[PDB]
Each structure stands twice: as C-alpha cells, then as structure tokens.
Amino acid sequence: HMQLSHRPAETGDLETVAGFPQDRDELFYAYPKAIWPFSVAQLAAAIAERRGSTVAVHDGQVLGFANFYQWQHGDFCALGNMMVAPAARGLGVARYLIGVMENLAREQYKARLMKISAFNANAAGLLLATQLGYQPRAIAERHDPDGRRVALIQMDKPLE
Ligand SMILES: O=C(N[C@H](CO)[C@H](O)c1ccc([N+](=O)[O-])cc1)C(Cl)Cl
Ligand SMILES: O=C(N[C@H](CO)[C@H](O)c1ccc([N+](=O)[O-])cc1)C(Cl)Cl
C-alpha cells in the first residue's frame, strides 16, 4: 500500500513542504520559532541552520519532511521540523521518517541516542514517540505565540 521512499530535501520540494502545516498550532508544534503564515523563506532558513533535511515520498508525492535540530557526533541527535502532508496523516509517514532519521543519526553522527521533544498539546506526537520506544525524561516550560505557557515534553530513545 503505502510504499515510502526517502531522499535529501531539495529546493524544488520547499513549496510543497511549506504547504504542510494547516494552522498555527501545527506550525508551532513543528517549528515553534516560525511565524504564521509559513513560507518557503522560513523553511529555507531552518534547513540552513539544521542538518539532515529529508523528505518521504509515496506515489511520486512528497508527503513528509524532517531534520535534525541538534546533532553531536558520538552522542545524540534531536529530531526537528516533522511535517506531513495533510492528505497523508495517520498513514505511517511520520513513523517512517523517524526510523530513517534514527538510522541517519546512528550512521552519520554515531549517535547513541535520539531525542524527540513534543509540545504538550501534540497528543499524536507524544503517542507516536511512545509507540516507537521513546521515554519521557524532562518537561520544560515554553511559551506559545499568544504568550501562553506550554510544556515541552523531552523524550529520548537509545539507538541500534
Ligand atoms: O499530526 C500531529 N502531530 C504529528 C505527530 O507525529 C507531528 O508533530 C506533526 C506536526 C506538524 C505537522 N504539520 O504541520 O504538517 C505534521 C505533523 C498533530 Cl498536529 Cl495531530
Ligand atoms: O541566505 C541565503 N541562503 C541561505 C544559505 O546561504 C539559506 O538558504 C537561507 C535562505 C533563506 C533565508 N530566509 O529568507 O530567512 C535564510 C537562509 C540567501 Cl537569501 Cl543569500
């Protein structure tokens, strides 16, 4: 069914990926420093600052995007910017990309651990990470775009 492949993100993918977040909450979950409306320029700025920007493809469509927020050779990487096409939610795209990013963290960065953090309102992300073997380690206070306090739940998982 949902055959998925991956490759590094390319300039040609920017518009498509920038179309993924459907509301301010979704943008905040994936890219908390971004400002709504999202734009190719904001996506390109993240890609420049980060590593490992990767897309997931199915039936000739880019359906997902992720990168590393943090990377420390021999130590850990932290997942960032997970976005999924609105017509492909709940089909395994985020799960698939997390596995790809785990492999890349192991292979390229010799990471022993992957970190995933999710904002408290992002139930789906918390639950998916839990399904994939991530455990919560800490909770940090953050603020949303309206200045309201939110909880960032910081999870991790050993790699192999
Ligand atoms: O789909 C969600 N969260 C997933 C969990 O894997 C992920 O955090 C995500 C965030 C933003 C997004 N987007 O804006 O396209 C897509 C997936 C919630 Cl918005 Cl319901
Ligand atoms: O700054 C630029 N490129 C960098 C890489 O050198 C990166 O691609 C980027 C693009 C857009 C951007 N932005 O508009 O915020 C920031 C960085 C060009 Cl606009 Cl000159």
Phi, psi of 74 (to 5 degrees): 80, 5
CA 86 to chain centre: 15
Structural domain count of the chain: 1
Tokens of 144: 């949303």
Ligand 2 centroid–CA 150 distance in Å is 30
Contact 82, 102 (CB under 8 A): no
Q: Which residues are near ligand 1 (CB < 6 Å)?
A: 20-21, 26-27, 29-30, 82-84, 89, 94, 122, 124-125, 128
- Ligand nearest to C-alpha 125: 1
Per the CB < 8 A criterion, the answer to whether 32 and 121 are in contact is no
Q: Which of 11, 14, 47, 50 to mutate to test the pocket of ligand 2 (most atoms within 8 A of CB)?
A: 47
Residues in CB range of 7: below 8 A, 6 or more apart: 54, 55, 57
Report the nearest atom of ligand 2 relative to the CA of 48.
7
- Domain of 43, CATH number, reads 3.40.630.30
Q: Please tell me the residue having the least CA distance from ligand 1 atom 16.
A: 83
Q: Are 28 and 38 in contact (CB under 8 A)?
A: no
Method: X-ray
**Residue 35 per-residue DSSP state:** -
Q: At 15, give phi and psi (nearest 5°).
A: -60, -45
CA of 97 to the centre of ligand 2 (A): 25
Rounded to whole angstroms, the Cα distance separating 53 from 80 reads 9
The partner residues of 44 in beta bridges, in order of sequence, read none
Between CA 92 and CA 94 the distance in angstroms is 6
Alpha helices (H) along the chain: 14-18, 24-30, 40-49, 93-109, 123-131
How far is 82 from 156, CA to CA, in rounded Å?
16
Atom of ligand 1 minimally distant from the CA of 26: 14
Comparing C-alpha atoms, which of 60, 131, 66 is closest to residue 93? 66
Spatial distance between the Cα atoms of 135 and 117, rounded to a whole number of angstroms: 10
d(CA 105, CA 28): 24
**What is the extent of the structural domain holding 36?**
1-160
Count CA atoms closer than 13 A to 117's CA, side-chain side.
Answer: 23
Q: Residue 28: what are its φ and ψ, rounded to 5°?
A: -60, -40
* DSSP notation for 79-98: EEEEEE-GGGTTSSHHHHHH
